[PDB]
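Notes taken during the Thursday session

The instructor put the following on the board and asked us to keep it in front of us for the whole hour. The protein is Aminopeptidase N. We were told not to look anything up and to reason only from what is written here. First, the residues (889 in total):
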Amino acid sequence: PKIHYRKDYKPSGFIINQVTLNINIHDQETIVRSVLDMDISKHNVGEDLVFDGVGLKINEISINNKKLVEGEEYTYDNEFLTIFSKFVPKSKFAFSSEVIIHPETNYALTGLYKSKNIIVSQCEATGFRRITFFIDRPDMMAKYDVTVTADKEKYPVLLSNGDKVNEFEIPGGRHGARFNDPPLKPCYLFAVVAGDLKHLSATYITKYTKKKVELYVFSEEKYVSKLQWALECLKKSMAFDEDYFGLEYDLSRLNLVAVSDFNVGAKENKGLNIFNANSLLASKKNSIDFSYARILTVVGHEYFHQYTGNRVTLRDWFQLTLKEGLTVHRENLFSEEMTKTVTTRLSHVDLLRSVQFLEDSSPLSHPIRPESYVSMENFYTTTVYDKGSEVMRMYLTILGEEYYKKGFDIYIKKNDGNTATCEDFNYAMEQAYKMKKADNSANLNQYLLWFSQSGTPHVSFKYNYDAEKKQYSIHVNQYTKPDENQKEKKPLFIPISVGLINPENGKEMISQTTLELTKESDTFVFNNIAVKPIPSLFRGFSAPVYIEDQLTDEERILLLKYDSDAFVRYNSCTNIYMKQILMNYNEFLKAKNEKLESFQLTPVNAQFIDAIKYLLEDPHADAGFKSYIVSLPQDRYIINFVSNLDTDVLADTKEYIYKQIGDKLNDVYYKMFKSLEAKADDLTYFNDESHVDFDQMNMRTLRNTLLSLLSKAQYPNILNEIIEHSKSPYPSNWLTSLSVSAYFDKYFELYDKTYKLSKDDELLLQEWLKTVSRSDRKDIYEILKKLENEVLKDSKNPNDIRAVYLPFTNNLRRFHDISGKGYKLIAEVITKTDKFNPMVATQLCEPFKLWNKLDTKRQELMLNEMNTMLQEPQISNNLKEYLLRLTNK
Ligand SMILES: [Zn+2]
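Then, after some discussion, the predicted structure tokens were revealed:
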């Protein structure tokens, strides 16, 4: 396997000025003809002309309209096409080729492939080489003239980049359309779509130039009634970029297309965004609440690529976080503004500190700008995306809105029409940093370590208050554990948004303050502090770090009740849970190790339980925030604090803590579940797809959370509420009734009931599979066998496979069964999936990422399965590289 290194970048010895494409789609084959108007660059040294071309069947290749001969003039090994330099011209020449590809049998969903009855392309990152020969790297900018022909009955809608400049009939029931896209673009932003698409349409008028923009959202005819919310989110996205960043859409038309078979959430192209159907289609009747925030984020995300991608593209794929981290950052600002709920930011932190922190402490650890790769498809990670977003968000925290918007404008103006790197963005932010501090000697050179240094920093605190002096001191210390990427970790530029809370009245004591920690340790002193405060640290989660607040549970409860910042209250509650979890874990662990006939467990803090009741009973507190405080931290967040985790002991720990709190608050849980029904399940706007109330959906989340707690506790006659819940029109409700019925004899009755409600909608049935998959059933393995034989079958749809297996992998007690049956199960699924889709096979390895953090017996079980999968003779490069790095080989 060839390893690409970031330090080895050098420009190409060739230039591609113009691409002229003819894509002829037939029933059993697709013929691709391409003429490349090329030239010799100033970096040429007379080397061989080597194109990328994977899986192409050559009919002929030429240079200046003279056919080349295989063996003597060129070689092709199904991966690289090598034209020997003695046959390569020294001036402007034309390279042409005709290849045959087969999207009908392209089940890897990369390049050009068929999804149901729609043919679409996925060229990010190295997918264009699967369509035709090219120097498939982002710094090769070219102009595109693309013609597409197909059977008119099967593919009446033809879409590609640029303007549709010609439509013509073809003998034999065929037709063609030609698209010219004059602006230079990299090949990964090439896109083509063909199918019997139906659409919703709207006209958007830009803010400053008053230009009319046509908006189109496409799907198959069956699901055309699920396009309305996506259209609304597109309008919201365009208005937000205009209002926040002052950026207008550059083109006259924008297309969104939903496809059923897709490896990820979506992929941007210039003017034509292609989506996984589950991230674009929704209706109140056929979608759970989660889809509405998901479509909003994903539609906004792909739109926020348009302006920046139209001017500043990536120089190489090591800069992936420059376009991905920044776009997720803009995506999160957008959703925070649109939802107007504190749980939007909380949900982003919750995923980062669980999924991303696990990855950053695993053998897969990498910085947001890696130093090397052999398969680019394996570095579209939560580190590059979500930690990258947090690093881009810290620029805004450090600079504030005004100077951040200025640094953003500098970045575009300085690099417009060219490729850029992470250093280019840091330079533009540095120029804004010098302007804010009013000191042209200031710099952000230390900030570059956020791009180069792996691992999660640890930030610890000590305090001192001199009552006589009214002087308060915060001693801060930072540290990053050494790993395989750096033996010596350097201190980072860590912004710490802090407040000081008066414990006597809950009032703020200082104005907005962001501490700038740039050393291994520092002491920040505050004068005129009238009383000893309680510190509110890392407000808004101002840095991607482990926070060790060193506060007592009494101080954390006071923050939980009275602090102004949603994250610090959420983090204080998290800290109290973790202290309880680690204590009860060790007590169960030593009782199991010493084989005790009797032992003691430390109760949950009674004042902590009283505080939760205080907040739950507050009518003016946020329902989404309430659902967070009644839920223990994620398992994947807990495992970052326990060595040799025994999953059975952790399950017993969570079980004890939940029942301790339920033993006191279940009457309050039931009262809230009943009082919340009116507003949470209000049907006033059930048939208005464009009316979305994120506050209302958070009420449903709280009801579904409390109903789960009450069902686990076997609350008296709670089955009556479960049966009634089954009849709610909201899929979030009646799918919850299925999962909570797992603790009752009526489970399979609701199983069949909800299946009948889900089977006729493709996306809804996938949500039903997820609900069954995550059901806390003792017979879950037999239920999974029923899903395979009766529903899933031999489906190659990644949404089907992921829905059946991934939620089951989070069942702490059953997936981690000590026999290893759960590991053998997923291992068989990955190997089966790797035969037709390596990218989805790698995604299904997610449960193995924590393998070296479990008890010794489970480490052995997981490692044995991973070594079994590595010995498969037909293993893909993607899966092999992933498992090699994960097992430290
Ligand atoms: Zn993106």
